[PDB]
Design a protein around this motif. Structure first.
Motif, PDB file in Angstrom:
ATOM      1  N   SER A   1       0.828  -1.195   0.000  1.00 27.86           N
ATOM      2  CA  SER A   1       0.000   0.000   0.000  1.00 27.86           C
ATOM      3  C   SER A   1       0.867   1.251   0.000  1.00 27.86           C
ATOM      4  N   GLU A   2       1.965   1.187  -0.741  1.00 23.86           N
ATOM      5  CA  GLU A   2       2.886   2.306  -0.857  1.00 23.86           C
ATOM      6  C   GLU A   2       2.663   3.083  -2.136  1.00 23.86           C
ATOM      7  N   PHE A   3       2.312   2.378  -3.210  1.00 23.17           N
ATOM      8  CA  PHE A   3       1.929   3.053  -4.437  1.00 23.17           C
ATOM      9  C   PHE A   3       0.799   4.036  -4.186  1.00 23.17           C
ATOM     10  N   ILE A   4      -0.059   3.758  -3.208  1.00 18.82           N
ATOM     11  CA  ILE A   4      -1.195   4.620  -2.911  1.00 18.82           C
ATOM     12  C   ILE A   4      -0.730   6.015  -2.519  1.00 18.82           C
ATOM     13  N   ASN A   5      -0.019   6.109  -1.397  1.00 22.49           N
ATOM     14  CA  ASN A   5       0.376   7.415  -0.889  1.00 22.49           C
ATOM     15  C   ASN A   5       1.373   8.075  -1.819  1.00 22.49           C
ATOM     16  N   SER A   6       2.297   7.288  -2.368  1.00 22.45           N
ATOM     17  CA  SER A   6       3.225   7.841  -3.338  1.00 22.45           C
ATOM     18  C   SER A   6       2.481   8.537  -4.463  1.00 22.45           C
ATOM     19  N   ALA A   7       1.469   7.879  -5.029  1.00 19.97           N
ATOM     20  CA  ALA A   7       0.782   8.451  -6.177  1.00 19.97           C
ATOM     21  C   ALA A   7      -0.024   9.676  -5.790  1.00 19.97           C
ATOM     22  N   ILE A   8      -0.718   9.623  -4.655  1.00 16.12           N
ATOM     23  CA  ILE A   8      -1.499  10.780  -4.216  1.00 16.12           C
ATOM     24  C   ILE A   8      -0.611  12.010  -4.116  1.00 16.12           C
ATOM     25  N   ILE A   9       0.469  11.891  -3.347  1.00 15.28           N
ATOM     26  CA  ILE A   9       1.295  13.056  -3.077  1.00 15.28           C
ATOM     27  C   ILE A   9       1.993  13.523  -4.342  1.00 15.28           C
ATOM     28  N   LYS A  10       2.493  12.591  -5.150  1.00 19.73           N
ATOM     29  CA  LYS A  10       3.155  12.994  -6.381  1.00 19.73           C
ATOM     30  C   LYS A  10       2.191  13.701  -7.317  1.00 19.73           C
ATOM     31  N   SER A  11       0.918  13.313  -7.316  1.00 16.82           N
ATOM     32  CA  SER A  11      -0.021  13.970  -8.216  1.00 16.82           C
ATOM     33  C   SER A  11      -0.286  15.395  -7.772  1.00 16.82           C
ATOM     34  N   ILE A  12      -0.505  15.604  -6.473  1.00 22.43           N
ATOM     35  CA  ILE A  12      -0.756  16.990  -6.072  1.00 22.43           C
ATOM     36  C   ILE A  12       0.517  17.824  -6.175  1.00 22.43           C
ATOM     37  N   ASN A  13       1.690  17.194  -6.155  1.00 20.46           N
ATOM     38  CA  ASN A  13       2.913  17.937  -6.433  1.00 20.46           C
ATOM     39  C   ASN A  13       2.987  18.324  -7.901  1.00 20.46           C
ATOM     40  N   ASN A  14       2.762  17.355  -8.787  1.00 21.10           N
ATOM     41  CA  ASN A  14       2.932  17.572 -10.218  1.00 21.10           C
ATOM     42  C   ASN A  14       1.950  18.580 -10.772  1.00 21.10           C
ATOM     43  N   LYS A  15       0.689  18.531 -10.352  1.00 23.15           N
ATOM     44  CA  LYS A  15      -0.275  19.379 -11.038  1.00 23.15           C
ATOM     45  C   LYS A  15      -0.081  20.844 -10.667  1.00 23.15           C
ATOM     46  N   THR A  16      -0.411  21.216  -9.438  1.00 22.20           N
ATOM     47  CA  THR A  16      -0.322  22.617  -9.048  1.00 22.20           C
ATOM     48  C   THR A  16       0.985  22.883  -8.315  1.00 22.20           C
TER      49      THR A  16
END
Ligand SMILES: CCCCCCCCCCCCCCCCCC(=O)OC[C@H](CO[C@@H]1O[C@H](CO)[C@H](O)[C@H](O)[C@H]1O)OC(=O)CCCCCCCCCCCCCCCCC
Ligand SMILES: CCCCCCCCCCCCCCCC(=O)OC[C@H](CO[C@@H]1O[C@H](CS(=O)(=O)O)[C@@H](O)[C@H](O)[C@H]1O)OC(=O)CCCCCCCCCCCCCCC
Ligand SMILES: CCCCCCCCCCCCCCCCCC(=O)OC[C@H](CO)OC(=O)CCCCCCCCCCCCCCCCC
Ligand SMILES: CC[C@H](CC[C@@H](C)[C@H]1CC[C@H]2[C@@H]3CC=C4C[C@@H](O)CC[C@]4(C)[C@H]3CC[C@]12C)C(C)C
Ligand SMILES: [Zn+2]
Lengths: 99, 52, 50, 35, 93, 180, 346, 32, 33, 70, 18
Positions: A55-70
């Motif tokens: 369940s590491e891909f979960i938090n990794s992806a969430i945080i990386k997405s909010i980093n990448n977009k805005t």
């Protein structure tokens, strides 16, 4: 008219019988509530047998997405995320316990 | 994933909370129709490509 | 308006900041940009100005 | 949700509770009118 | 040429309610069909004289569904409380 | 106030009607290219009759403009406020009959829509005079609209309270209970 | 008949023996692709050309019960009764008016009343057609009375007219009914100019460059004709409505009117076309889905020059039922005489 | 509202006629 | 045969019972009297 | 007490409904098709009821009460 | 009828804080 009513009711019951019994070709049966050993596959917790625990891909992806977009805007967004999540859980608990 | 398809995360997964987890048929139709139709911009005359 | 009256215990009047916050945000940014078109289409011809 | 709410076990509990409630209400009526 | 009209419905518009003509097997009915992602369906629908109809489809998606989702989460407690209230007070007055 | 608002808008609408109609020379009718290249004035300009008859109408709306500015600046404290009942008739009767003709101008086969600089003030002033007569018949006190909006708001408050308590979250749950 | 009732598309096998695999024809036939639509049948040009759809549109207008006023709130008072549009055979327009009026400044040609007199007199030679779509529900009696009222006045103030003169007898073609003559005539020696000159040597000489040898109505034929036309009009309101029970009326028994037979259904339209020698053809078409629409042929009268001139003037005369209709009609009727066509199907 | 499109139609039609007549005169004069 | 549907009907589909319905059937036949 | 006034309302509205016979079958069509799929609800009330509404169950209810076959 | 009086008043406290 009552005579036709009674004869029609008799033939309707006979049609229902026939359909429950064999190949009758224009009728619709009624279904019933099942109150017995219903489901059978839920009475049991078998999660530990099928994964052979015996369940590491979960938090990794969430945080990386909010980093990448805005600057320090990523920090504002991350603090907003964490704060709103904790507040959601707390509000849920309190509202539940208020009944 | 390693094959573990999903998990729990303590972050509320807004797509479920607002009911946006299904993708609106027209969008999928467009995406597939554009995936099954690769486009050739070059012309085999200029680039001496005779075979697919 | 109803929920604020129930929560705060007093009806918001133009003397209180709740009225003006509601007015500005709610009315002026959600209800005005279309009531304006409705009026500019249906009520100014009921007067002289074109 | 309704499949979970009207499960057979819950159905039998609702039946028993309704029966006992009807019994107690009618007993209240009986002991009240005979007073 | 047995189908007269189809009506896309749902919040994401992948179910249809097909209506059959009088020449169809069984007369005129209304049947629900769930559709897979087939990009040749709409040509087949129009080139056979079928009245294909769609919905309204709001563009927001998040302001549209936000008062109905709140209801989806709050109503169950209301149902449970009403049921047990019926039992323990509307009878056991 | 309310009647004051009507009279103010009447004076300013008629002021605009004049200040726009005369301060410019004249309008030009729609050409409608290809309209019977012969006579019957199709695809042509305008003429003495039209111009002067119109210059009149402007003077009529000026007269009622001056009547209304007088009434406003005089009975804005609404000398003696009542016997103006005389002038009131002169401001209402004419008005309604005017409207009558206008209300049948479509049946008369007239083109009232191509030129806004003339018919606008007439229609608007007829409507304003008629609604002024109506409001003077029942005396809208400029505070009765407050009672109307308060009534509708009270009704919608009673509606959202029922909705909230029935479908969202009971009022006996969210509010605090005493004594323990 | 039942196979045509449905549309099932059955592929055809290649008549060469080996495999008989279906032919690469396929095709969607944009007319059949258009059922399920409501108004018209979008058909993409070339298909409408090869289908022999040679009647372009020239003008649009409406017949109001009350024209709407800007100054009422939104102008919702204006209640329309009919929507009118006009069509004219574009090849005949380019042959007739394209030899004389073509090649000049359009505004200069529009400036003189000779062109207007032409387009009002040269109508029935273009097969001019007018379509009236009922913008709402209408009881029949009022429509009959209103049309009689609005056309009797044109019928009275009608002057003796100018009519063309027959250059050829043109017998029907008995043995081969379809066989039409003009493909030969316009290339009879491939030099049909002098042969046509010899043909017109008998009847009359073309009074101009367009090729029409006109003829003003005589002292007679201009009084009995209008009398018979008024007689026809005076027989309208009870022909459609004989007796008080609508159930026996002709339009009762078809979807053009309500099942009660007392009101004309919204969307139904009437088609009126004008043939040269005083012929009027009227048809009706129901409204709705293109797949279930019907078409009825109501009556094909003959010999009424008065009716032809009266309707041609009512739509395109000096004082019509709506002016911009006839103005735009004259304009975009000048348009194709310069070689092109409206709705550019090339 | 058709009138405006008609204006543009007549403008373009006159331009068409005039441009072709001008080019015809010019080219045939250049030949001769 | 050319104009036949191949989608049968809602009506001409005959009933067929599973095993539980067979059991219910024999019980309802035996306790008939 | 609803029956006595219902008797007077019946004949009173019967002729008024038999008069139109076309709008009366246009409004009924629109009303039925609009209650089937509740898709007018967002623009008019703000709550999008089309997400929790089942058109098939409503159609089956309609046909059941029309044929009297529960 | 929990909110009517606040409108009739027109068209007719956490002691621990201080
Ligand atoms: C007039 C139109 C209104 C008819 C009255 C409806 C009666 C209300 C009781 C059922 C409706 C509840 C509802 O809106 O929630 C919506 C309900 C429940 O909704 C379903 O709830 C389920 C529970 O888990 C799931 O969550 C489903 O996702 C959700 O769709 O669904 C329907 O009502 C769908 C339409 C079924 C309509 C049946 C006919 C109406 C019942 C007869 C009423 C007789 C009236 C005469
Ligand atoms: C117009 C103005 C507004 C009027 C509002 C009218 C009512 C609008 C909301 C009604 C439907 C609510 C909702 O959609 O259902 C969501 C919930 C399920 O909860 C939910 O269940 C869901 C799973 S599922 O749908 O059950 O499968 C799950 O996703 C969710 O988390 C869970 O909360 O469903 C119900 O509570 C309604 C049950 C049906 C109501 C009739 C009761 C029958 C009497 C008892 C016997
Ligand atoms: C309008 C806001 C609607 C936004 C809701 C969107 C989806 C809600 C997901 C919640 C999931 C929580 C849960 O796991 O569900 C479980 C949870 C059970 O505990 O469900 C509940 O209890 C629900 C609690 C009741 C929610 C109602 C509160 C919303 C309105 C707040 C008061 C009005 C405020 C005052 C107005 C001020 C006017 C300016
Ligand atoms: C009138 C303006 C214009 C209407 C065009 C139609 C309504 C007019 C023109 C041709 C006419 C008919 C010719 C033959 C028939 C049949 C015959 O039986 C009696 C006379 C009658 C009715 C004629 C009367 C009705 C017809 C169609 C606009 C206002 C629509
Ligand atoms: Zn994965």
């Amino acid at each position: 008219n009552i005579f036709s009513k009674k004869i029609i009711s008799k033939v309707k019951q006979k049609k229902q019988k026939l359909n429950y019994m064999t190949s009758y070709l224009n009728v619709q049966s009624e279904h019933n509530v099942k109150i017995f050993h219903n489901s059978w596959w839920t009475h049991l917790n078998i999660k530990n047998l099928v994964n052979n625990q015996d369940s590491e891909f979960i938090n990794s992806a969430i945080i990386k997405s909010i980093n990448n977009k805005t600057s320090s805007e990523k920090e504002t967004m991350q603090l907003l995320l964490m704060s709103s999540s904790i507040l959601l859980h707390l509000c849920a608990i309190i509202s539940l316990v208020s009944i | 994933c390693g094959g573990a398809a999903w998990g729990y995360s303590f972050f509320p997964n807004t797509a479920v909370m607002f009911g946006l987890e299904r993708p609106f048929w027209g969008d999928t139709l467009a995406r597939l129709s554009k995936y099954w139709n690769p486009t050739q911009v070059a012309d085999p005359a200029r680039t001496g490509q005779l075979l697919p | 308006l109803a929920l604020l009256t129930w929560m705060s215990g007093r009806l918001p009047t133009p003397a209180t900041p709740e009225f003006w916050m509601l007015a500005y945000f709610g009315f002026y940014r959600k209800v005005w940009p279309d009531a304006a078109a409705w009026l500019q289409g249906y009520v100014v011809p009921l007067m002289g100005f074109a | 949700f309704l499949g979970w709410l009207l499960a057979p076990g819950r159905l039998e509990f609702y039946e028993k509770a309704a029966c006992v409630a009807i019994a107690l209400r009618v007993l209240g009526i009986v002991i009240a009118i005979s007073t | 040429g047995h189908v007269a009209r189809v009506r896309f419905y749902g919040p994401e518009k992948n179910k249809v309610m097909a209506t059959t003509r009088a020449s169809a097997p069984g007369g005129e009915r209304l049947c629900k069909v769930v559709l897979p992602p087939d990009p040749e369906l709409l040509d087949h629908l129009v080139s056979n004289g079928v009245v294909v109809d769609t919905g309204v489809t709001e563009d927001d998606r998040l302001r549209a569904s936000l008062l109905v989702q709140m209801l989806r989460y709050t109503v169950p407690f209301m149902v449970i409380s009403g049921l047990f209230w019926m039992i323990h007070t509307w009878i056991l007055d | 106030t309310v009647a004051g608002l009507l009279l103010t808008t009447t004076i300013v609408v008629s002021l605009y009607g004049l200040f726009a109609a005369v301060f410019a020379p004249a309008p030009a009718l729609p050409v409608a290219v290809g309209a019977w290249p012969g006579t019957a004035a199709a695809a042509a300009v305008m003429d003495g009759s039209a111009a002067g008859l119109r210059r009149l109408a402007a003077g009529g709306l000026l007269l009622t403009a001056a009547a209304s500015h007088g009434l406003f600046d005089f009975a804005g404290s609404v000398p003696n406020p009542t016997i103006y009942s005389l002038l009131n008739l002169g401001f209402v009767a004419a008005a309604v009959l005017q409207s009558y003709f206008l209300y049948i101008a479509p049946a008369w086969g007239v083109n009232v829509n191509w030129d806004t600089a003339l018919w606008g003030p007439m229609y608007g002033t007829a409507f304003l005079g008629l609604v002024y007569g109506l409001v003077a018949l029942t005396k809208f006190d400029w505070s009765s609209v407050v009672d109307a909006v308060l009534r509708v708001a009270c009704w919608f408050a009673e509606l959202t309270m029922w909705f909230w308590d029935t479908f969202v979250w009971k009022f006996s749950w969210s509010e605090k209970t005493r004594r323990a | 008949a039942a196979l045509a009732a449905s549309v099932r598309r059955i592929a055809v096998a290649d008549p060469e023996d080996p495999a008989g695999r279906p032919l690469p024809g396929g095709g969607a036939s944009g007319l059949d692709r258009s059922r399920g639509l409501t108004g018209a049948a979008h058909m993409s040009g070339q298909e409408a050309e090869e289908l022999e759809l040679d009647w372009g549109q020239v003008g649009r207008g409406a017949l109001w019960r009350r024209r709407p006023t800007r100054w009422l709130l939104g102008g919702l008072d204006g209640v329309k009764d009919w929507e009118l549009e006009a069509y004219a055979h574009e090849p005949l327009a380019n042959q007739l008016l394209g030899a004389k009026y073509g090649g000049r400044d359009p505004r200069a040609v529009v400036a003189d009343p000779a062109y207007a007199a032409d387009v009002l007199r040269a109508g029935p030679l273009l097969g001019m057609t007018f379509v009236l779509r009922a913008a709402r529900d209408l009881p029949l009696q009022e429509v009959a009375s209103s049309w009689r009222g609005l056309l009797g006045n044109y019928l009275q103030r009608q002057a003796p007219l100018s009519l063309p003169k027959a250059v050829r007898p043109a017998h029907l073609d008995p043995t081969d009914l379809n066989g039409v003559a003009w493909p030969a005539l316009l290339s009879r020696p491939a030099a049909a100019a002098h042969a046509a000159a010899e043909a017109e040597a008998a009847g009359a000489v073309p009074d101009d460059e367009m090729g029409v040898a006109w003829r003003v109505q005589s002292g007679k034929e201009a009084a009995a004709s209008v009398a018979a036309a008024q007689q026809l009009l005076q027989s309208l309101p009870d022909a459609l409505c004989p007796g008080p029970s609508p159930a026996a009326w002709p339009l009762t028994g078809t979807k053009l009117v309500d099942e009660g037979g007392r009101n004309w259904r919204r969307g139904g339209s009437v088609w009126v076309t004008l043939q040269p020698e005083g012929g009027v053809l009227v048809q009706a078409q129901t409204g709705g889905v293109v797949g279930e629409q019907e078409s009825y042929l109501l009556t094909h009268v003959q010999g009424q020059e008065a009716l032809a001139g009266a309707v041609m003037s009512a739509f395109m005369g000096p004082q019509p039922l709506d002016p911009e209709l006839a103005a735009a009609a004259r304009s975009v009727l000048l348009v194709p005489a310069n070689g092109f066509t409206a709705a550019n199907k090339e | 509202n058709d009138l405006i499109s008609i204006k543009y139609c007549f403008n373009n039609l006159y331009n068409y006629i005039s441009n072709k007549t001008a080019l015809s005169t010019k080219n045939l004069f250049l030949f001769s | 045969e050319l104009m036949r549907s191949a989608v049968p009907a809602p009506g001409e589909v005959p009933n067929r019972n599973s095993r539980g319905q067979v059991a219910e059937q024999v019980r309802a036949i035996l306790d008939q009297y | 007490a609803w029956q006595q006034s219902f008797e007077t309302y019946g004949g009173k509205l019967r002729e008024v409904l038999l008069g139109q016979q076309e709008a009366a079958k246009n409004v009924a069509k629109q009303l039925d098709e609009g209650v089937t799929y509740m898709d007018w609800t967002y623009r008019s009330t703000g709550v999008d009821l089309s997400a929790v509404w089942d058109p098939e169950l409503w159609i089956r209810f309609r046909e059941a009460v029309a044929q009297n076959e529960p | 009828n929990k909110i009517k009086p606040y409108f009739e008043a027109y068209f007719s406290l956490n002691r621990w804080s201080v």
